[PDB]
Amino acid sequence: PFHLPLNHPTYLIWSANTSLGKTLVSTGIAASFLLQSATKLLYLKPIQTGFPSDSDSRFVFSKLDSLSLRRQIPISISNSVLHSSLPAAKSLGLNVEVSESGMCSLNFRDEKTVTGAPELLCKTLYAWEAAISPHLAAERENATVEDSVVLQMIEKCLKEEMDLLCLVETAGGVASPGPSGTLQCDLYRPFRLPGILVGDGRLGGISGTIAAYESLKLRGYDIAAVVFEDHGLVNEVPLTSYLRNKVPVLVLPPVPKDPSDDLIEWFVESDGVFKALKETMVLANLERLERLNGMAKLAGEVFWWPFTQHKLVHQETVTVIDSRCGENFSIYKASDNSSLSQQFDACASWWTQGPDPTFQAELAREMGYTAARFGHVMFPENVYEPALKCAELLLDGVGKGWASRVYFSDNGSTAIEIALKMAFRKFCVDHNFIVVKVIALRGSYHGDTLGAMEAQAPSPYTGFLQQPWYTGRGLFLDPPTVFLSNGSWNISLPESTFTSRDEIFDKSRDASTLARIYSAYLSKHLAHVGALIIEPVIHGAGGMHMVDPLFQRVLVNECRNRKIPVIFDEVFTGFWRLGVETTTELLGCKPDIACFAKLLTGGMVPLAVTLATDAVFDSFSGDSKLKALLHGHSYSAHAMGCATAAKAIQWFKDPETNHNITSQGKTLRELWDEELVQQISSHSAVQRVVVIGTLFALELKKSLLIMLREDGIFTRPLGNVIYLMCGPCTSPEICRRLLTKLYKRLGE
Amino acid sequence: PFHLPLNHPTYLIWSANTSLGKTLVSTGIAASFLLQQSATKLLYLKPIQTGFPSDSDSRFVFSKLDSLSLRRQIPISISNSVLHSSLPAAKSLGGMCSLNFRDEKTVTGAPELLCKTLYAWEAAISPHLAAERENATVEDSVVLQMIEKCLKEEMDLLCLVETAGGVASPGPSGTLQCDLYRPFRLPGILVGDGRLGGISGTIAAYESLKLRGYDIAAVVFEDHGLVNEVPLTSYLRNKVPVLVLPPVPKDPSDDLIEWFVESDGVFKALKETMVLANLERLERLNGMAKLAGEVFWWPFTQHKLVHQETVTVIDSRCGENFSIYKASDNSSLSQQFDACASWWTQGPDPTFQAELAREMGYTAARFGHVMFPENVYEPALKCAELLLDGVGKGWASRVYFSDNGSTAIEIALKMAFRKFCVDHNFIVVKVIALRGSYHGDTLGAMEAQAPSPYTGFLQQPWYTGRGLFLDPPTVFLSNGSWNISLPTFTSRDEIFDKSRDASTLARIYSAYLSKHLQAHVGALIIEPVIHGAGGMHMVDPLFQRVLVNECRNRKIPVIFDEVFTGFWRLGVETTTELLGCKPDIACFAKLLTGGMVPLAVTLATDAVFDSFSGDSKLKALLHGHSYSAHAMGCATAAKAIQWFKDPETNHNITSQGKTLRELWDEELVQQISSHSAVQRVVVIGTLFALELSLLIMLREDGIFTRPLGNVIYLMCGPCTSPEICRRLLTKLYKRLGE
Ligand SMILES: *Cc1c(COP(=O)(O)O)cnc(C)c1O
Ligand SMILES: *Cc1c(COP(=O)(O)O)cnc(C)c1O
Ligand SMILES: C[C@H](N)C(=O)CCCCCC(=O)O
Ligand SMILES: C[C@H](N)C(=O)CCCCCC(=O)O
Ligand SMILES: C[C@H](N)C(=O)CCCCCC(=O)O
Ligand SMILES: C[C@H](N)C(=O)CCCCCC(=O)O
C-alpha cells in the first residue's frame, strides 16, 4: 500500500564501505543544487548511529551554512532528529519517554530560516548512541525499529514535502545490517529508489566498489553514477572499463588529511565534479520519466498481447509495471503526479506467482549463479546438477510413490502434449495398435497448442477462430461441481450440504450413494478412448470450478480398471496453489502421467515437467531411435529453470522458509479469513464462491475490477468469474485485507 | 582444451579486500594439513604477486611453516620458487624475466610443502598498473595455462591457489581476477572482514563470486570484537560455515607463532570443511550418470541405447566449452566444445556469458515475472523495439511472445489462417511447405511438417500433415564447387545473388509452383535457407524466393520460420536478407535469448494483426502461455540482440561490413567436401555441416556434437573465434581419415 511520487528526483546515497566520503558526497550534491527560487533540498538520514557526537545530518546542515556564506547565497536551513534511543536522548539532557519499541520522539529541531530563500531540510529519522552497526545498537539500547516503520516513515516525509531534489543517505555499506538485522539493500528494496554509489579510491577500492555495485544490481536497483575520492591510484579506469562506460564514474580531488580542515575550499574545488554528479542525477530522472510517460502508448503500438482484443484495450487501461517486490507490482501512473504505487498481483500473473519479497531476492541470486555456472547446457544423454536435483525433488515429492521418470518441457502446453504422446503409446501397447480419443471433463483446459487443444472440449478457447484444425477430439463429460453458497457447501450435477469443505474431500464418501451412481454413469459411456486427462480438483481456465473430487476419483479407477492411461494435469494445481504440493493428496488416486508448470519455478521463469510411470516409460524402450519419444524443445531442462524450480520446490515445502506451512507438513494453513469467506458467499451479487489453498474465486449473479484496481488490487477475470490468487507464502493478514476490499466493493 | 584433476582438493583463496589475513589463512590451512602425525603434500600457488620482493606471500608461507614445524617438532621438506618476475623485480635480486630462483630445505620422506610464485612485479599496487609500469605483462590464458602445468606436474594432497587482492581486483591484463579464474571454476574459500564494514564487504565479495558461478566452501575472518559472524551466518542461511579467527597480535614485531597455535582449532575446522566438501562434490559427480539414467526421460532419445558409459557429466559451462567430469580419465574435469550449440541455442562468449548472468539476476530481482496482457514493462517493450527495428525491419508491426519455437510456430498458423479466412472470408485449410522442413513438436507445429522420422503414429496418432508438401531443390558444396539437386555454381554467392531472379530456373520454378498452386491452401511456411532438423539441407534460395512471390501473389500469408536461422546462426540477423523477400509472419527463438533461457517471438504485419480486431474477446487470438513475455527472457534477449549485432561487443561483426565474417577455414572446408567419405558439405555463418562412431572420435578431441543420423555438424556461436573453428575443422578432418 505504498504511494511515492516521481515528479521530483529522490536518490539513495550508497557507499561501498565506511569512511569513503558518503556524507561529503551528499553535501556537495546538496550544495551544487541549493547554491545556484522555491528550490528545495530534502536530505533524509533514516538511520544514524554514534549519535550525537556523529550526526551526518548535522554535518550537512553545518557545511551548507558555511558554503552558503562562501557563495554568499542565503538559504533557509533545518536539522531535525525525530527518534533516538534512550541513551541517545539522555546524551542531550532529556528525561524523554520510551515507546513499546524503545524509541523516543524528540522534539529536537534546529531551524535557521531565511524567508523565500532556497530551502534545505535535513532529517535524521532514527538515532542510536553507540557508534556501531545499527543492528547491535538496537539490541544494546533496547530501541528497535521494524523495516516497514522505517520505510513508512521515509514515505511520510517524502509525501509531506511533495526545483526539488531529495537525498536519502544510507547507513554503512551497501550490504550492512539495519536496526532489525535486515541488510540495508534489502530493507530499501520495496521502494526501489535509484541511487548513486560512493566508491573507494583507496587500494582495494576497485574490488570493493565493483562488489558493492554488483550487490545493488543483484537486488534490481539502478545506479546513476559512481563517485569516489582520488587517492592517486587511478581507480576510475578499471571501474569505467567494467561499467562499459555505461555509468559515469566521477573522481573527487583528495580530501585534506588535516583533521582541523574546514573542507570549505575542497568543496569549492570539487564544484566541478558535484555540478556533474547533480546533473547526472537530475537528468537520469527526467530520462526515466520520459520513458515511463511513453511506455503505454508504445506498448499499445508494438505489442500483440495474448488473450486480448486490442480494439477494446485503451491506452488508459494499459498498466505500466516498473518492478515487482514479492506479491506487489510497482505501477507508474502519470495521471497522478506521476507516481509509483504498490498494487497486489491478485491474478498471480496468470497463476505463476508465489515468492515473498524475501524469496524473490534469494531466487534472483540463485538464478544469476546458475546463469553464470551453466547458462544453458545440452540435456539429452547428459546430466548436470540443477536438472538432476530438480528431478529428484519432483519424484520424492509431487510424484511420490508412483512416478519413475521426469520429462522436461518449457510450459504447460508442451507438458500436456508430451503426456498425450506418452499416454497413447502406453495404450497402443496395452492393446497393440486404429483411431484414438481422449476422455475429459467439459470445461477442463490444458494449453493452447493444437494437441493440448484437442483434449479440450468446445469452449471460448477452442473453435474455428483459434485453430481451424481444432476438432474437439475426445469424449467430453459434464462434471458435477462443488461450491460455497450462503454459508454451506453445495453441489451441481448433470441433469442425469456437506458439513464442511473437508467432508467433500473425505474418504467417507467412497462408500456413498453417489460413488455408485457415478460409477454407473461412467461405466456406461465406457472412436477409441486412449487416455484420461483431468484438471484435478479445479477447472482453471474453465472458470475456477471445483469438480467433485469423488467423481474424479471414481473416473480414475474406471479408466485404470480399463487399462486406460491416467493423465493428471497439475499445471495449475501443483505446488501449493491449492494448499498442497500435489492434488494426488486430495483425489486419493494416483495417475500414470502428470503435468506441472506455472508454480513449478516459483513464478520466475518458465519450465515444465511431465512425470511418468516405470511402465509408461517402458512403452518406448525399443531398438530404433524411431521408437523413442521424439519430442523435445531446444531449451529442454534449461539449467536456469531447473535450478530455480529445485529451489522453489524446497522453499515452499519448508516451514522454516514458508511460514504458511503447517505441522504435518503436507499442508498449508487456511489463508482466507473464515469470516469474510462466509460473508461473501452470502452476498446478493455473489452467485457462488470457491475457496481452497491460495485460491479465492467467486462467480457473479470490466467494472468491479476497476474498483479493486483503486484499492490496489490487480486481477484478471474469466468473464463473470472473479478471483484473488496469492502465493504459497502470503500472510493471511494480507488476504484478509484483500477480502475486505473486495467485499466493500461488492456492496456496489 | 584444459584438463585438471579432482582426486585432490584444489582451492582458490579469495579475500573481500586487502589486509584481512588472506596469507595467514593460507598459512594456517597449510599448517593444519602438513603438521599431523607420510607422502602428505601441500602445493601452495601464488600466481600473481606485487610488491616483490619486499613482499612475498609465498615466502611468508614458506617461512611460517618452517617455524610452525619446529614448534610442533614435525620435520617437512619445503621449497619456495619464483618462476617469472618483471625486470625491475628481478634486478631487486641482483616482457617477463624467467628466474632460476628456488629455495629448498629438503627433509627426505617428510610431508612436503611446495610454494610457488608464478608471476611477480616490484611496485606495490594493482597488478594491472604494475604490468604497464614495468612493461611486464601476462595474458590470462598464459596465467591459467601455467597454473595448469603446475597443477598437473604434481598430480594425502591439498593445493591452495592464493588470489591477489580483492575478489574483483584487476589482474595484470586488467581482467578482474574473478573473471580471470572463471574458466577453471575452482571452488574456494573467502577470507572476510572482521572490522567495521566487514559485513557489507564480505557479503558483496561473496555475492560477486556467486554471480560468477563459483562455489564457496567457507568464509573465515579475524575477530575484531564486532560479532560480524552472526549477520554473515544469518545471511548465508547457515548453509556455509563462517569461521572466526582470534585477534591477531597488533605488535608489528610479533612472531604470530603462538597465534597460529592458538588458532589451530579454527584452522583444523577450515581444512576439514575444505577436504570434506571436495569428497562430497566427488561423491555426487561419481553418482550423477547412474542416477541420470534412472530418473530422467531424455527428449529425442531411445534409452535402451544409452549406456551409463555414454552419459556425459556436465559440471559447468564457460562460453563455448562444457566442463565435463570423467571418472574414467582419473576423476578429472576437462573442457569440451559444445559443437551442437546445445541444440542450436548457443552463442555467448565466456565474457558475454558473465555479462548475461548479471543482467539476468538483476532482472529476476527487479521483475521476476510480471503479467503481460494489457501491461508494459521495460525488458519486454525494449525487446519488441529491438525486434521490429532489426530482424523485422520494414515489414513487421507486431510482436507476439511465446515460450519456444513450437509455440511460436503454432501461433503463426492461427495468425496466418485468420489473415487468409478474412482475405477470402470463410471451409478446410492446409499449409504449403517443403518436404524435410521442420517446425516444432507440438501437434500444430507438427501438422505443417510432412512425414518424417519426426512424425507418424508412433509419435502422435493425430498427425496427418494438414498440408501440401513439395520436394525442394537443395544446394551443397562438393569437391571444391557448389552444386544443386532438384526433383554447378561459381561461388556460394552466385546463389543468393538476385541476378538469378532472371535465370532459366526462376521461370521453371515459377511454373512448377503455379501448377500445384491454383483441400485449400491456407499458409506458406518455410525454414528459410536451411532445413535444420531435416538434416542441414540448404534449400535453393531462388526456389523459396519464387515460392514466396507465388503465394504472396495469391494472397496466401507467408510464414518465415527463423527459429533456427534467426540472429546470426547463418551469419545474418535475419534471412530476410538472403531471400530478398519479406514475410507476413516470422518466428524466432533458440538464439533469440543468447542461449541462456527460452523465449520465442512471432512477428506480424499491420494486416495480419488487424485480422483479429473485433468487438468480442472471442474474436481476439486466444493463445498465450502463463509466462508470456517473461521479463527474464525478454531482458536477456534484448541484450543478446544488441551484443551480437555490435562490432564492439561481437568481434566477428566486420568493422567495415558489420556482419558475421567468415568463420570456417576456407582451405579446410574445401579439403573436406573434397574427401572420400564426405558426401556433401553445407557451410554458412556459424554452421558447418556435412553428410556421409565419428562422434566418438571427436569426443576425444574435445568436441561434443549431436548427429542427424548420417548428417554430422559443427555449430559455433555468433562470437566464436575463427582460430577455434579452424582448430575444429582440423580435428574433424584428421578423424575423417579413419
Ligand atoms: C496454465 C495451464 C496450462 C498450460 O501452461 P502454459 O504454460 O500456460 O502453456 C495447462 N493446463 C492447466 C490446467 C493450466 O492451468
Ligand atoms: C528448433 C526449431 C523449432 C522449435 O523450437 P523449440 O524451442 O525447439 O520448440 C522450430 N522450427 C525450427 C526450424 C527449429 O529449428
Ligand atoms: C601490493 C599487494 N599485493 C596488494 O595488497 C595489492 C592490491 C590490489 C588492488 C586491489 C584494488 O584496488 O581493487
Ligand atoms: C530438438 C529441437 N526441437 C530441434 O530443433 C531439433 C530437432 C530434432 C533433432 C534430434 C537430434 O538431436 O538428433
Ligand atoms: C558508526 C558508523 N556510522 C558506522 O559505520 C556504523 C555501521 C557499520 C557497518 C556495518 C557492517 O559491519 O557492515
Ligand atoms: C495463460 C495460460 N496459458 C493459462 O493456462 C490461463 C488460461 C487462459 C487465459 C484466461 C483469461 O483470459 O484470463
Q: What is the CATH number of the domain that holds B18?
A: 3.40.50.300
- How does DSSP assign B139-203, residue by residue? -HHHHHHHHHHHHHHT--EEEEEE--SSTT-B-TTS-BHHHHTGGG---EEEE---STTHHHHHH
Specify the DSSP class assigned to residue B296: B
User: What are the grid coordinates assigned to B61, written together?
Assistant: 608461507
Q: Give me the residues of A, 390-449, that contact B with CB < 8 A.
A: 391-392, 395, 404-408, 410-414, 417, 420-421, 424-425, 428, 435-436, 447-449
| Judgement on whether residues A221 and A271 belong to the same structural domain of the protein | yes
Strands (E) across B293-357 are located at 312-318, 321-326, 332-338
Q: Does B44 touch chain A (CB under 8 A)?
A: no
By DSSP bridging, strand B585-588 and strand A405-409 are: unpaired
The domain of A156 spans 1-282
In chain B, % helix, strand, coil (3-state, to 5) comes to 35, 20, 40
Clarify whether residues A673 and A638 are in a common domain.
no
User: Count of H helices and E strands in chain A?
Assistant: 24, 30
Query: Do residues B401 and B544 both lie within one domain?
Result: yes
* DSSP type of residue A122: E
- Cβ partners under 8 Å of residue A723, min gap 6: A346, A347, A544, A695, A696, A697, A698, A715, A717
Chain B residues whose beta carbon lies within 8 Å of the beta carbon of residue A469 = 429, 444, 447, 466
Strands A164-169 and A40-48: parallel
A578 and A466 share a domain? yes
- In the sheet with B188-191, reading across from the earlier edge strand, the strands are B97-98, B77-85, B112-120, B41-49, B157-162, B10-15, B188-191, B216-222, B242-245
Where would I find the beta strands (DSSP E) of B249-380? 312-318, 321-326, 332-338, 375-376
Closest CA to A225 of A285, A270, A178: A285
Q: What is the 3-state secondary structure (H, E, C) of B2-27?
A: CEEECCCCEEEEEECCCCCCHHHHHH
If you measure CA to CA, which chain B residue comes closest to A359? B365
Q: Give every CB contact of residue A694 below 8 A, 6+ residues apart in sequence.
A: A348, A576, A577, A578, A579, A668, A671, A725, A726, A727, A728, A730
Residue A296 CA to residue A153 CA, distance in Å, equals 31
Q: With residue A407 as reference, give the H or E element that holds it.
A: strand A405-409
Query: How would DSSP label each residue in A435-498?
Result: -EEEEEETT----SSHHHHHTS-SSTTSSSSS-TT----EEEEPPPEEEEETTEEEEE-----B
Helix axes B198-210, A205-217, angle to 10 degrees: 70
- Interatomic CA distance for residues A379 and A408, integer angstroms: 9
Query: A233 C-alpha to center of ligand 3: Å?
Result: 10
Report the C-alpha gap between A465 and A418 in whole angstroms. 25
β A545-547/A481-485 pair status: antiparallel
- State whether the beta carbon of A718 lies less than 6 angstroms from ligand 6: yes
Question: Could B366 and A323 be called an inter-chain contact, meaning their C-beta atoms sit closer than 8 Å?
Answer: yes
Separation of alpha carbons B499 and B95, rounded Å: 55
- Return d(Cα A9, Cα A81) in angstroms, integer: 23
Residues in contact with A516: Cβ distance below 8 Å, sequence separation at least 6, in sequence order: none
Identify which of B318, B352, B211, B175 has the alpha carbon closest to the alpha carbon of residue A211: B211
Give the end of a domain, one of B625, B649, B673: B649
H or E element in which residue B689 lies: strand B687-691
Atom of ligand 6 nearest to the CA of A716: 13
Same domain, A206 and A235: yes
Beta bridge mates, A225: A196
Residue with cell string 460413488: A515
CATH number of domain containing A622: 3.40.640.10
> Are A315 and A429 in a shared domain?
no
The pairing of strands A608-612 and A538-539 is: unpaired
Residue B470 CA to ligand 1 center (angstroms) comes to 35
Point out the domain boundary residue: A615, A641, A657: A657
Encoded amino acid at A373, one letter? R
Kindly report the CA angle at A609 between A603 and A610, in degrees rounded to 5? 145
CA B631, B632, B637, B642 torsion-angle sign: positive
Q: A381 to chain B: which residues are within 8 Å by CB?
A: 298, 301, 306, 310-312
| Whole-angstrom distance, CA of residue A436 vs CA of residue A453 | 15
Residue B306, C-beta contacts closer than 8 angstroms, at least 6 positions apart: A381, B293, B298
- Together in a domain, B234 and B304: no
Shared domain for A202 and A254, answered yes or no, is yes
3-state secondary structure B207-229: HHHHCCCCCEEEEEEECCCCCCH
A-contacting residues in B 77-136 (Cβ below 8 Å): 125-126, 128-129
The annotation places the binding site of A for substrate at 49
- A329 lies within 8 A of chain B by CB: yes
d(Cα B229, Cα B234) in Å, to the nearest integer? Answer: 8
- B199 in contact with ligand 5, CB cutoff 6 A: yes
Helix (H) or strand (E) holding B475: strand B474-478
CB contact under 8 A, B626 and A219: no
Helix (H) or strand (E) holding B723: helix B722-736
Instruction: Give the count of Cβ contacts less than 8 A between chain A and B.
Output: 579
**Do the beta carbons of residue B538 and residue B713 sit within 8 Å?**
no
Q: Work out the number of other CB atoms within 10 angstroms of the CB of residue A141.
A: 22
Distance CA(B175)–CA(A411), nearest Å, equals 39
Q: Residue B403's closest CA among A410, A302, A445?
A: A410
Query: Cβ of A360 and B364 within 8 Å?
Result: yes
C-alpha cell at A182: 535486515
Is A430 in the same domain as A418?
A: yes
In angstroms, what is the resolution? 2.8
From the CB of A15, is ligand 5 less than 6 Å away? no
What whole-number distance in Å separates Cα of residue B644 and Cα of residue A129?
Answer: 55
The CATH code of the domain that includes B691 is: 3.90.1150.10
Structure-derived torsion over alpha carbons of residues B547, B552, B555, B559, reported in degrees to the nearest 10: 80
Closest CA to B138 of B91, B83, B195: B83
- Give the closest-approach CA distance of A358 to chain B in angstroms: 10
Q: Residue B475's beta-bridge partner residues? A: B484, B538
Residues A206 and A330 in one domain: no
Helix (H) or strand (E) holding B526: strand B520-526
Nearby residues of A470 by Cβ (< 8 Å), 6 or more positions away: A450, A453, A454, A462, A463, A464
Which residues make beta-bridge pairs with A382?
B312
Instruction: List the Cα angle B396/B400/B405 in 5-degree steps.
Output: 100
Torsion angle defined by CA atoms of residues B206, B207, B208 and B210, in that order, rounded to the nearest 10 degrees: 90
| Structure-block grid coordinates of residue B522 | 491456407
**With a CB-CB cutoff of 8 Å, which residues 540-579 of chain B face chain A?**
none
Is the peptide bond prior to B453 cis by the omega test (within 30 degrees of 0)? no
Instruction: For residues B208 and B285, state if they share a domain.
Output: no
Last residue of a domain, one of B275, B291, B321: B275
Q: What one-character-per-residue DSSP string does A543-586 give? A: TSEEE-HHHHHHHHHHHHHTTPPEEEE-TTTTTTTTSSS-THHH
Using CA coordinates, name the residue in chain A closest to B216. Answer: A369
Q: How was this structure determined?
A: X-ray
**What's the gap in Å between B166 CA and the centre of ligand 3?**
7
- The rounded distance, in Å, linking the Cα atoms of B639 and B592 is 10
DSSP states of B68-99 as a string?
HHHHHT---EEEEEEEEE-HHHHHTT--PEEP
In the structure grid, which three cell numbers stand for residue A233, read together?
A: 591510484
B161 residue type, one letter: V
The angle formed by the CA atoms of residues B359, B365 and B370, to the nearest 5 degrees, is 100
Q: Residue A166 corresponds to which cell in the numbers above?
A: 531529495
Q: Fill in the DSSP letter of residue B521.
A: E
Q: What are the pocket residues of ligand 2 if the criterion is a CB atom closer than 6 Å to any ligand atom?
A: A 633-634; B 404-406, 409, 438-440, 527, 532-533, 561, 563-564, 589-590
The answer, yes or no, to whether the previous bond of A52 is cis (omega within 30 of 0) is: yes
Say how far apart CA B107 and CA B86 lie, in whole Å. Answer: 32
Nearest ligand 1 atom, CA A410: 7
Grid cell listed for B596: 541462456
Q: Is A662's Cβ below 8 Å from some Cβ in B?
A: no
Identify whether the C-beta of residue A169 lies closer than 8 Å to the C-beta of residue A125. no
Cβ(A173)–Cβ(A15) below 8 Å: yes
Q: What separation in Å is there between the alpha carbon of B343 and the centre of ligand 4?
A: 6
Q: How many domains does chain B have?
A: 3
Q: Are residues B313 and B265 in the same domain?
A: no
